[PDB]
């Protein structure tokens, strides 16, 4: 994956950039479940780790045929007025390589309590005795908010840009474009 395509959120008087970034990420995810495979990687070039902000840019990492297919496919319908685009081009080098991975946290003690009750046949009080409320961990990481279509929930999807490395390795990506082993050029 030596090719990239930058997408920057146009400023909108109607919307904040986080809402636009989340609906763009959901539509990219739906485009990848429509496409299939594990070869599509994402990034956030104007990231702010300190303020936990994604920035205002998103960058896809793939081959050029994937970029020209995704630049005209109807997952960009209704956002071309919200979005300005670049051109499908080759990445610069030398670049450090890092991973973009979805991090999940045990954020609700009661759901894991109900799982322990389902898998150990305990009552509610044994689940509260075995699992306290200190267990709940909150991440200090930026996030998109996503509407599931299988189930009906709205959940925060916390992303982590991994450590910078001098070389990249093989692997795939999930249907959200996040690394389950793959690496992306970071520039």
């Amino acid at each position: 994956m030596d090719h990239y395509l930058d997408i920057r959120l146009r400023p909108d008087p109607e919307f904040p950039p986080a809402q636009l970034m989340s609906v763009l990420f959901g539509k990219l995810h739906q485009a990848l479940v429509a496409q299939g495979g594990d070869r599509i990687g994402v990034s956030f070039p104007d990231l702010d780790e300190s303020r936990s902000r994604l920035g205002e840019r998103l960058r896809i990492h793939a081959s050029a045929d994937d970029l020209r297919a995704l630049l005209a496919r109807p997952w960009l319908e209704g956002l071309r007025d919200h979005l300005q685009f670049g051109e499908p081009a080759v990445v610069p080098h030398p670049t450090p390589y890092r991973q973009v991975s979805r991090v999940q946290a045990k954020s609700n003690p009661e759901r894991l309590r109900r799982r322990l009750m389902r898998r150990h046949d305990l009552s509610e009080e044994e689940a509260r005795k075995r699992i306290p409320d200190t267990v709940a961990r909150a991440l200090d990481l930026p996030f998109v908010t996503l509407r599931s279509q299988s189930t009906g929930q709205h959940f925060r999807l916390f992303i982590r840009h991994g450590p910078l490395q001098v070389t990249a390795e093989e692997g795939g990506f999930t249907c959200y474009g996040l690394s389950k082993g793959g690496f992306v050029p970071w520039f």
């Binding site: 919307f15 539509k27 319908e77 209704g78 919200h82």
Partner: peptide, 9 residues
């Protein structure tokens, strides 16, 4: 307002 941005048509 928000019902347009994810619409396909």
């Amino acid at each position: 307002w928000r019902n347009r941005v994810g619409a396909e048509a």
